[PDB]
């Protein structure tokens, strides 16, 4: 049972620049002191990435502003989130996000992650509902509150769970019937923007889902310190968490491989003529 959290349909989203982000290891082979050109669905450098702010707005403005819209899935998506206290918990992928078609539910409680692809009738605004108490000063159990019915399940998988301080990055891609997740976790300290630096994502898992994926919706966990059984959707607060979504595109990259096998730099071969000439000349310095 879910009671609609917000009446406001949408707010005008504002975008930031994804400077040199979202680079993932293309293959599982080791290379040292090697400049390597690889074609895949990479995220374009210096792209436009939608910035979502699920935070409590000031009391003068309307009491609710947190947003979890159903966003398109276009040949894979890039997802990041700068947060503390694990506000973001899981995502939901599927075509219609309703009962007639199958959809992928990937939700992660701090101790564990559940990945089920089953026909799900979803709530408009799904949220994991945590509660907190004042006398004990401890945080308590949660309520799932994400789907009304689950039927014809075909795959279950359970594994170890996968200012601002935490910067988590994920890349989702569905190719040839498999759903692949690339991840990276990095402590950071710039509060409101994507860091200016290079980070390489590592292959977490690839799944044999075989489902059509057209749209995805993020799952946020909400906290209220009082519970009554007959009245809900009143008193929920989003804390302070921000997530970012970008879209992948078929592009060619040239990668710098370090002595210890890490990816330290990469070049977008379609940014400008200078980047193209670097990509063709296989050198990061052009004379």
């Amino acid at each position, epitope marked *: 049972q879910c009671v609609n959290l917000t009446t406001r349909t949408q707010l005008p989203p504002a975008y930031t620049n994804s400077f040199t982000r979202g680079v993932y290891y293309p293959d599982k082979v080791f290379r040292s002191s090697v400049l390597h050109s690889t074609q895949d669905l990479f995220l374009p450098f210096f792209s436009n990435v939608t910035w979502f702010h699920a935070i409590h707005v000031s*009391g003068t403005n309307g009491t609710k502003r947190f947003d979890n819209p159903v966003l398109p899935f276009n040949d894979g998506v890039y997802f990041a989130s700068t947060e503390k206290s694990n506000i973001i918990r899981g995502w939901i992928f599927g075509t219609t996000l309703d009962s007639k078609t199958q959809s992928l539910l990937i939700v992660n409680n701090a101790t564990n992650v559940v990945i089920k692809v089953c026909e799900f009738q979803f709530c408009n605004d799904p949220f994991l509902g945590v*509660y907190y*108490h*004042k*006398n004990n000063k401890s945080w308590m159990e949660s*309520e799932f509150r994400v789907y009304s019915s689950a039927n014809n399940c075909t795959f279950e998988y359970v594994s170890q769970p996968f200012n601002f301080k935490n910067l988590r990055e994920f890349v989702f891609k569905n190719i040839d019937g498999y759903f692949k997740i690339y991840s990276k976790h990095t402590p950071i300290n710039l509060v409101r923007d994507l860091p200016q630096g290079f980070s390489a994502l590592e292959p977490l898992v690839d799944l044999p889902i075989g489902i059509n994926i057209t749209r995805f919706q993020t799952l946020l966990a909400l906290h209220r*310190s*009082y*519970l*009554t*059984p*007959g*009245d809900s959707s*009143s*008193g929920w607060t989003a804390g302070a968490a921000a997530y970012y979504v970008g879209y992948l595109q078929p592009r060619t990259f040239l990668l710098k491989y370090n002595e210890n096998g890490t990816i330290t730099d990469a070049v977008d071969c379609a940014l400008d003529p200078l980047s193209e000439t670097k990509c063709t000349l296989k050198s990061f310095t052009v004379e």
Partner: antibody
Amino acid sequence: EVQLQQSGAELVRPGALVKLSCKASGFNIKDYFVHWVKQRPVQGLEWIGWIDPENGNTIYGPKFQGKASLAADTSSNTGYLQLSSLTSEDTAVYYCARWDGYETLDYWGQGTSVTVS
Amino acid sequence: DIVMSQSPSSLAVSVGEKVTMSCQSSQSLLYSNNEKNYLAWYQQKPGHSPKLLLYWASTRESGVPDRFTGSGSGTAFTLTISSVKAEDLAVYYCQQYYNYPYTFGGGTKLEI
């Protein structure tokens, strides 16, 4: 033991607001929630609602939703209730209560009784 | 909103007699997620501020041991005394905690 200190009996004119004070010892109002109560021998006792000192907001009941206001300040261990203007319905006994999260009301003061000329 | 009814209105029994009071509700009190019944019982004397008796049917709290024993259902709720005691002149109420407002029953009185 927890005990509460409450406004004494009041005799007032209609057509004007009224203020009440509910006091606590042994804890901070932030630690709990605060309910208010008005009681009538005939027509029974009524339930007003709860105010959260930590939130800075308050959720009221629907019968009392009109002609009621709740305020709190942590500086003193005191919570306050006020009404827009005194009607015959408001000419009643009044009580304040403390409500634990995920739980019942646990503390009730001596009370306050409003009689009107 | 939830409405509460109480019975008996008033009953007179000798000290040591067994007495039972029952209050009935028009809606269910059971909450599936916790499987917990959000109901309490109160006892009050004239001119004494109402004080909570232990909720969730676990009526046992500090005081004289097992003063009053209670039983409840999804829609029905009863309180029992195995032997009426002279000191315990009491008036009782039934309240619910399922939705606003927390209902107050019609009241029950016990006379000796």
